[PDB]
Design a protein around this ligand. Structure first.
Ligand SMILES: CC(=O)N[C@H]1[C@H](O[C@@H]2[C@@H](O)[C@H](O)O[C@H](CO)[C@@H]2O)O[C@H](CO)[C@@H](O[C@@H]2O[C@H](CO[C@]3(C(=O)O)C[C@H](O)[C@@H](NC(C)=O)[C@H]([C@H](O)[C@H](O)CO)O3)[C@H](O)[C@H](O)[C@H]2O)[C@@H]1O
Ligand SMILES: *[C@@H]1O[C@H](CO)[C@@H](O[C@@H]2O[C@H](CO)[C@@H](O)[C@H](O)[C@H]2NC(C)=O)[C@H](O)[C@H]1NC(C)=O
Ligand code: NAG
Ligand code: NAG
Ligand code: NAG
Lengths: 323, 170, 323, 173, 169, 323
């Protein structure tokens, strides 16, 4: 008669590493790291992404005429920009504080497009024919659909022009303006006028004034001229006074703006957006798992497992498998 | 600290015992069979489940970098971001990989101890009524039926009941 | 006769968590985390805090006329700024590098107020009546107590004025100046003059020169004009040359500045200050403990236990309690 | 792992022993009583106190956030700071909470081992002069007075002194 | 996690055993001598070597600070950099110093276990053919030559072979 | 006959720390931290460091006449700047974006010096006689060897001057220019002219313009005038148009620049560079070790062990030594 004390063993070939021994076979274990992804974008909490398509982020909010599909109301969970978008800042010049603008919009949830300043606002000037071959829509020349290029009247002179917008509205306003810089004085005189010219912007919390910097510079997109692009936020309750006697690229349409409750994201990727749901969206793809760690990406929107460099993180739960 | 039971004086495992981690093998005129010890098995499962959930729970938070951009005149703050994001990645990678190594060792030793204690639990009971073969098995100096075997399993082995019978077998 | 070996047990019900089991009663343990606080501010190293009361930090160092209470030398252990202070920059305009200024003063221990440029420095001008309804003291108009509004003489014109301060002194000096921007050409002519006007500041390490940006701006405290506020540090050994023929808001009173050997703090709080001493002061309150961790706030002055998100961190020192 | 003594083969603790963690209970012709083992109890105190002081000492430094302010054109630098402050907060929150769990386990196992070792140290002396009841108790095959008990506690039990008397009670029972 | 063997019931070490960590001392009519247990010593060596290498491998990465400069109007980001670099410095110091304390305890407790287990391996074989002196030594109730000694050491001791001779004593 | 089981012991007095006990002698252990250093600089991958000697970093890339030794092609592994170098920005004024420029050079490997704008470029002006006592070369007064001081002709007015550099080349160009600020208007008229004067720079990606900011300033190196120094990178393919009517400090010699693929460094030290090779170079010295941690410096360029505050990190590998 006998009785023995013993322990379990099975067909497992799964291994773990220990501090004293590596490649040690155990009966039961659990992988904590996920390395699989759906290379596509889905919906976060049933809210679709914003596809900027063949437009850069600048091109969309500035209103590059070839971004017409996107020139409307937009509500997103996250934004995805394509690496090789053709349609951006078509007329040469730099957008001041560009990166600060991307982060703001990134922290946005919803925008509403409206007309801040009708073309009739600017009395004494030519509000049409302010277009460029560098910003084409189809065949002929065009210009940004949120900005108004103003040149002097052929017959008279360019007088001081003024506009005012009282933001009695619910939400914050996001608007854009610019100063055009001709390459030679000849063009300065022709489009605007000689003498001292100024572009002046003002709110209760902002003070902006600029002058033309006429200089000969290299041609970009067939343009030796430049526009310094500027953006700002008109706070709720505040009021914008625009004052200029020359060289103004005026605000025309702008955006009522909505802040996002948690953090939002802007992905730069070629991955296709689809009508699907995800709890976890990385810039590299969607993750579906109950696991705790990842290999795919540090960049994500939603609720993802922690990102590490590890290839495998397997805890032993069983014991040494010894057949 | 290896406890010397698993892969020790108990040389191997049992593919025949499939309802638990820790258990028994017996032989009678009534027969033979495997039976896991569900007591220590349940306590082991509860601990390890708690251990794994606890680890998952402390890994719950995440450092999450963002995709903000920087100009060519912002090289320094750009690199500052870079060294920070890489900083925490290296830290959590370290914490994860090292914890797995250290606690796998702990987990494996835990089973080893559980086997050891169970064997001791039996040895302490049988005393000189059984022959300790040293390999985790015991030969009875008396006849031990199925109900007898159960008392060993139930932890209620009756030493003075069989002391008389066993000792006579010299 | 018999002997037994056993272990301690008592009436303890204090519990700890282990990796394998939760809520386990032990005979002896020690709490490492403190979660109690005195909702008040106390004294650090026998030095009282500076309460800015109904003044913002800008309002105090600029000398907002309604901050007379604070017009002196100030020596603090930490600074406490009040959430809904009215008295700040009373006359509209922006303070350049505002946030860097707060960080500087925050790292300060003591400032000494003195007269940098007496009104006799500025010969040929009206140093009185440089006042505004936008900075009222009680009923009538007033103005900042560290700045001098200089306008033209009623009888004649505004001539070039000059000032010089050689900092042969002990410590670095913190001073303030501005450039005034009238809203319309009328006030420019009336207050200063029609020609080209300039404000010139210069030291061994600074070069500052500006002209007015006359513009109609939205009304703030009944003012369509603006003044650009500036601050800087006059290093020991350096020398300030002030030169202006218009639009100058001159330095008048300034501050000798003392660097704090360690880091200082600025709290934004409604909490009442009292007559008490603290070894460590958080923005949420006082901590009195020998424990190693804290629960209350990440922002503190003095010496506090480490801040964590934990509710409890209890080490077991005794053993499993089994009565 | 569990060394199987505390809440193990020794099923319960002693509220009657109030001067130590580890100890003895005896029964002889003069009566009964509890007595702590001052050696092993003190050694346990020194180790755990060292353990607690060492942990507190490595927790000595602090990450200290500040109250610097940022403009609406410093959103990125604002966000960078926050993710840093939250970053180190999550790291130390983790390090402390996990260390407590893991070292509480070790500490409890430590007491178990010390009791376990103490039981062996006594068993090793008595040998066959006493009966190992399997529950942490020993029954003497002889008369064991207070001085006898004392030698056991102090670790100076004289086995051959009582050897013959014992065999006679094992040759009469 | 003391197993009570090293500096325990085996009160002291052997400066006489120089070819291993764990081992044997025997006495017979043929003589006496020290001999390491090459198996268990080697298993411990491979394990400890692995422990040190694993730690070195996980400490491989570094936080690497830089020498970028800041103006006095960049006080905040300068302070931000400082608190970050010092931040991770305190973090690895914690990780480095605490790990040394905790695993040194483990390493020493491990050896203690190896000695205890090896001692168990011997006791389980000899049983009542030998007298357990309680200090890690066994006195044989029979005559144990070099071949006998080796079987104990090689783990091949023949219990019933010596049962008769032993019991008579 | 008897057999005993025992453990190793030796003459070791080396001690380690455990969580339960300190100062514990063990038979075998290993130190993980290195605390030894060679107080000198060596070669990283057989490329010598660049010693700036008695010149600051600014002084070298600007071409301070007293930095002639350094004015040539340079290829380095890291740069060592001497704490008390005399020769920096010799002519008073501030270098715009100084720190970003330093960070740029730090990530560099090699520079190539060439003449960007020959002096014959600037027709109608005095391209000679642009020198100062604040920037002496040898005996006489001089000026930067990468910059050109241009002043007005007595005979003719100072006309709009123009230059063009098309970067058809392989690599990026790092160049420098400036705007001169006279202390008084008399000197402005004498050197440049009595009207409004401007310095205007332009590329496909840049638009730059300035005017003189005249102010009365204290003497620095015997000069009460100032120059605002500027730098930028001319990308491959881009083209520089220079246009100015006054106050221009023109580019003259510049550098083709190559980006470092790896991490670069700039050390502030008095340590001697020597004829040696190193895998690890800290700002405090050379490290030669197999250990995992270090004590010497957080700043290094090669591949160094992790830096910690510890004095000793010794793991026990053997066992408790009990003779
Ligand atoms: C089309 C126009 O409005 N003016 C062009 C001008 O035609 C004028 C003619 O209609 C009128 O009767 O008489 C005057 C003479 O008194 C003119 O002849 O002819 C010029 C010929 O050199 C054109 O200049 C060319 O402009 C090009 C750049 O721009 C265009 C463009 O982007 O496609 C035309 C756009 O309408 C215009 N946008 C405006 C005015 O809002 C832009 C704009 O001027 C510049 O882009 C801003 O810097 O220019 C080429 O540069 C070409 O080399 C140049 O000759 C007049 O455009
Ligand atoms: C199996 O063991 C349990 C104890 O764990 C036995 O139950 C106890 O039996 C004693 C007397 O036999 C009673 O005084 C107790 O009240 C019982 N319960 C407990 C919780 O101790 C049980 O009888 C054993 N089974 C067999 C078949 O012997
Ligand atoms: C329009 O602006 C005025 C002040 O300019 C202020 O009352 C408010 O912002 C707006 N008025 C109303 C009635 O909404
Ligand atoms: C015991 O466990 C559960 C939740 O884990 C609950 O009863 C209680 O929160 C715990 N005890 C204490 C003291 O928190
Ligand atoms: C350990 O050695 C150090 C070295 O001086 C000594 O200061 C200390 O008192 C010793 N004992 C400890 C740390 O318990």
């Amino acid at each position: 008669d006998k009785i023995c004390i013993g322990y379990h063993a099975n067909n497992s070939t799964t291994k773990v590493d220990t501090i004293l021994e590596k490649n040690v076979t155990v009966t039961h274990s659990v992988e904590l790291l996920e390395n699989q992804k759906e290379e596509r974008f889905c919906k976060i909490s049933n809210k679709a992404p914003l596809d900027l398509r063949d437009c850069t982020l600048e091109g969309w909010i500035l209103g590059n005429p070839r971004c017409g599909i996107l020139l409307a109301d937009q509500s997103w969970s996250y934004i995805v920009e394509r690496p090789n978008a053709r349609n951006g800042i078509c007329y040469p010049g730099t957008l001041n504080e560009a990166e600060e603008l991307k982060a703001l919009i990134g922290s946005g949830e919803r925008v509403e497009r409206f007309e801040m300043f009708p073309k009739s606002t600017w009395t004494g000037v030519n509000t049409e024919s302010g277009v460029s071959s560098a910003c084409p829509l189809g065949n002929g020349p065009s210009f940004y659909r949120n900005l108004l290029w103003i040149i002097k009247l052929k017959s008279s002179e360019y007088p001081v022009i003024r506009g005012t917008f009282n933001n009695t509205g619910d939400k914050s306003i996001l608007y854009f303006w610019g100063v055009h810089h001709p390459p030679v004085t000849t063009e300065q005189n022709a489009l605007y006028g000689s003498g001292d010219r100024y572009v002046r912007m003002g709110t209760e919390s902002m003070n902006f004034a600029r002058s033309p910097e006429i200089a000969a510079r290299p041609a970009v997109n067939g343009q030796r001229g430049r526009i310094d692009y500027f953006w700002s936020i008109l706070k709720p309750g505040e009021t914008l006074n625009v004052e200029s006697n020359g060289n103004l690229i005026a605000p025309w349409y702008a955006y009522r703006f909505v802040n996002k409750d948690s953090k939002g994201a802007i992905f730069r990727s070629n991955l296709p957006i689809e009508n699907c749901d995800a709890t976890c969206q990385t810039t590299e793809g969607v993750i579906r798992t109950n696991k705790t760690f990842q290999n795919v990406s540090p960049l994500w929107i939603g609720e993802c497992p922690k990102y590490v460099k590890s290839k495998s993180l397997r805890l032993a739960t069983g014991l040494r498998n010894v057949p | 600290g290896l406890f010397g039971a698993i892969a020790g004086f108990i040389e191997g495992g049992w593919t025949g015992m499939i309802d638990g981690w820790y258990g028994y093998h017996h032989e009678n005129s009534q027969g033979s069979g495997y039976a896991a010890d569900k007591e220590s098995t349940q306590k082991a499962i509860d601990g390890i489940t708690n251990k794994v959930n606890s680890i998952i729970d402390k890994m719950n938070t995440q450092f999450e970098a963002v995709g903000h951009e920087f100009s060519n005149l912002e090289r320094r703050i750009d690199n500052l971001n870079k060294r920070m994001e890489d900083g925490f990645l290296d830290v959590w990678t370290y914490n994860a990989e090292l914890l797995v190594l250290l606690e796998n060792e702990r987990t494996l030793d835990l089973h080893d101890a559980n086997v050891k204690n169970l064997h001791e639990k039996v040895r302490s009971q049988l005393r000189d009524n059984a022959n300790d073969l040293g390999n985790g098995c015991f030969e009875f100096w008396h006849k031990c039926n199925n109900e007898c075997m159960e008392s060993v399993k139930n932890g209620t082995y009756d030493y003075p009941k069989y002391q008389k019978e066993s000792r006579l077998n010299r």
